[PDB]
Amino acid sequence: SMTKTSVDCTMYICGDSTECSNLLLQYGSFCTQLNRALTGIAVEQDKNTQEVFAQVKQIYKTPPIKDFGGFNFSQILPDPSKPSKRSFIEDLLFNKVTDLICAQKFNGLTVLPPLLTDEMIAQYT
């Protein structure tokens, strides 16, 4: 999935001015459909994670007494002592992937939060 974004042409044409609002009424729904198009994108971003990350509705756990038959799975398994559940591999996957966003929000660019957080995704995994 990608970053959910929402844009409003009400504040994009200009803010706190009746001159923009009056002329947008003459243009009608031109950017009203654009607001619905970007809204539908944010809906598709959350549905991409549902059909992939969660295969089943049941949650499974590891045993307290672990006999793996000689393999070491402690690398892929999350750490139960951490407040956020993460494995040794997921620690690098999160840290190696990189205000710019806050400055863009001042022009009317709204970044919607995801449906599932980092704690959620690791629990389905």
């Binding site: 999935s1 990608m2 991409n48 992937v97």
Partner: protein
């Protein structure tokens, strides 16, 4: 137009004079906004194909055992380990070579 800030234009030119100036600024921004939306709809279709391919690899490589060659990776597929990643997912493929 004269300037890109309406606070300077509306505070100077007359309503009949500033109407032409603001009309060019709005039309340009409406076209600039449609350009971004169109580019996002294209990436929305590209990210959907990667998501549909993700659900296919998650089911066949991880949940079950797939016999497909060059799907779960090189070699005879045994199992696969999914891993959480920012805006994506990482697949650890165990194969027989």
């Amino acid at each position: 137009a004269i300037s890109s800030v309406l606070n300077d234009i509306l505070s100077r030119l007359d309503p009949p004079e500033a109407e032409v100036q603001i009309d060019r600024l709005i039309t340009g921004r409406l076209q600039s906004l449609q350009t971004y939306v169109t580019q996002q709809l294209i990436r929305a279709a590209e990210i959907r194909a990667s998501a549909n391919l993700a659900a296919t690899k998650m089911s066949e490589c991880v949940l079950g055992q797939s016999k497909r060659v060059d799907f779960c990776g090189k070699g005879y597929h045994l199992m696969s380990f999914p891993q959480s990643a920012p805006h994506g997912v990482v697949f650890l493929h165990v194969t027989y070579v």
